[PDB]
Ligand SMILES: CCCCCCCCCCCCO[C@H]1O[C@H](CO)[C@@H](O[C@H]2O[C@H](CO)[C@@H](O)[C@H](O)[C@H]2O)[C@H](O)[C@H]1O
């Protein structure tokens with residue numbers, strides 16, 4: 411045991427909780443927009459969804475800047491990491507707020523959309539794969555600390571193309587991996603496969619995000635103007 415590792419766990423947990431409202435703390439609310447049938451795109455829903463996405467991108471940057479050592483990387487490397495991982499983290503975030511009984515996902519302001527509305531907001535042919543990912547995330551029963559640490563591990567990764575100092579990024583990731591294993595095993599000692607299961611979710615997350623990037627291309631043709639600039643920074 412080391413005090414430094416325990417401090418890292420709590421720092422990351424706090425950074426996550428303070429940039430990602432929990433489903434339980436949110437005042438959920440609904441919309442009646444295009445709620446029953448799948449359409450190509452409901453522009454009202456796209457407007458609301460894309461605005462929320464911009465806000466969450468800013469929150470993910472805020473989260474990143476609170477991760478120990480992140481701001482010690484070159485600005486170029488910080489941007490490179492954020493561009494590489496933002497969509498992964500957005501996916502993890504929305505899927506964490508999945509309510510299976512109601513077949514809904516809840517955004518950071520409490521906006522709660524059913525599957526059809528998620529489709530109509532822009533997810534389109536990606537919707538059911540996203541819900542399937544959320545469904546397969548559930549049994550892991552991850553808590554906020556674990557979700558925070560996993561998000562940090564997804565972001566701080568030395569394999570990203572065009573990194574100036576990949577070995578430096580590698581070194582920053584090391585304690586995050588150690589922290590997640592220590593925490594996961596302590597919390598649920600009778601479920602020792604939880605750590606490796608969590609790590610394998612990273613690969614699943616990358617897979618769904620690649621599909622997300624593909625969806626963005628087709629979505630660009632359906633929208634009446636360009637996507638919001640921070641969304642373009644994430645995708646383009
Ligand atoms: C994925 C690609 C990544 C590319 C890197 C982009 C990093 C840019 C992040 C913005 C950094 C500056 O952030 C600073 O100004 C932003 C714009 O006024 C604010 O951004 C936002 O803040 C509020 C709460 O987060 C939001 O409800 C508002 O939409 C907006 O004002 C930040 O609260 C502020 O701390």
Ligand SMILES: CC1=C(/C=C/C(C)=C\C=C\C(C)=C\C(=O)O)C(C)(C)CCC1
Nearest residue numbers: 462463466500501504517518533622626
């Ligand atoms: C942004 C964006 C996309 C993905 C959004 C995802 C995957 C999650 C959004 C999460 C939010 C916005 C959570 C919150 O508010 O807590 C897709 C690929 C559809 C293409 C259009 C732009």
Ligand SMILES: [Cl-]
Nearest residue numbers: 642643645646
């Ligand atoms: Cl570009």
